[PDB]
């Protein structure tokens, strides 16, 4: 349960982007999306919900 909770919360996932790559003609902006980021410190690791 400890291990399973780590890779579920301490993870670097990759989501697509706004305005993708095959876009809708008239799209003004193209920006990437950030979801979950890899944890940095000991306090952040002390806050994993089991």
């Amino acid at each position: 349960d400890v291990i399973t909770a780590i890779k579920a919360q301490n993870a670097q996932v990759a989501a697509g982007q706004l305005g993708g790559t095959p876009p809708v003609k008239g799209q003004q902006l193209n920006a990437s999306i950030i979801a979950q980021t890899r944890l940095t410190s000991t306090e952040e690791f002390g806050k994993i919900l089991l």
């Binding site: 990759a14 989501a15 982007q17």
Partner: protein, 45 residues
């Protein structure tokens, strides 16, 4: 110094360079570039 011997030495130097010109097609350069070994990975999204 007689001629007939030398006029054959020229033929050796003629045919040796004439066979060395068969490096056709000869490239423009001479490799200058300090070797470039590239690693590439793609993580989509």
């Amino acid at each position: 110094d007689r001629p007939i011997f030398a006029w054959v030495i020229a033929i050796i130097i003629m045919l040796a360079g004439g066979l060395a010109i068969l490096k056709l097609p000869v490239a423009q350069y001479p490799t200058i570039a300090p070797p470039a070994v590239t690693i590439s990975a793609s993580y989509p999204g």
